[PDB]
Design a protein around this nucleic acid. Structure first.
Ligand SMILES: [Mg+2]
Ligand SMILES: [Mg+2]
Ligand SMILES: [Mg+2]
Length: 105
RNA sequence: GAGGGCGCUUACCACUUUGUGAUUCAUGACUGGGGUGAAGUCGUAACAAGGUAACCGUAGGGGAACCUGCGGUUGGAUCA
């Protein structure tokens, strides 16, 4: 409760119980998520509010309220896990491989 | 004179000092695991004969669930 300013920002990472949300200027600010969120991935623009600092200048978390529409999505299914999206909202993929341990085709 | 007092000295001994142990609390870089986490990643181990029957003890292996070797049990199916 007692949330802050609704704004657009880019999610840095995903940690299940919470997520790292970068603001519109480059501020690392971790936030938890809304219970109605079906999925949240790395690099997804969201609607979020950075809570309210209890101590003056020292805040713990904010919340991520809403999720914008997807440009792309990387959904890969799995046995006994179902279809799970990994990443989204991307234009280019770079397949990176090495000769060690193996280089398969 | 007898005797007493003072003073001195000795015995006992508190506090106090050094050397060096035992024990206890607080602090403590670092470090060992474990628990609590529905949505995160990695795999599909076990529960059906769960797709190499499982489990226990022990040794070795490797991100990991685990696997292999030896021995035992049925808390195993199908089987005469
Ligand atoms: Mg299995
Ligand atoms: Mg099995
Ligand atoms: Mg056996």
């Amino acid at each position: 409760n007692l949330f802050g300013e609704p704004d657009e920002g880019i999610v840095i990472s995903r940690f299940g119980m919470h997520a790292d949300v970068e603001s519109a200027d480059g501020d690392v600010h971790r936030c938890n998520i809304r219970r109605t969120i079906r999925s949240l991935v790395t690099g997804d623009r969201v609607v979020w509010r950075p809570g309210k600092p209890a101590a003056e200048g020292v805040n713990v978390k904010g919340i991520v309220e809403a999720v914008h529409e997807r440009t792309s999505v990387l959904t890969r299914p799995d046995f006994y896990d179902g279809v799970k999206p990994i990443a989204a909202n991307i234009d280019q993929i770079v397949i990176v491989s090495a000769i060690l341990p193996e280089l398969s085709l």
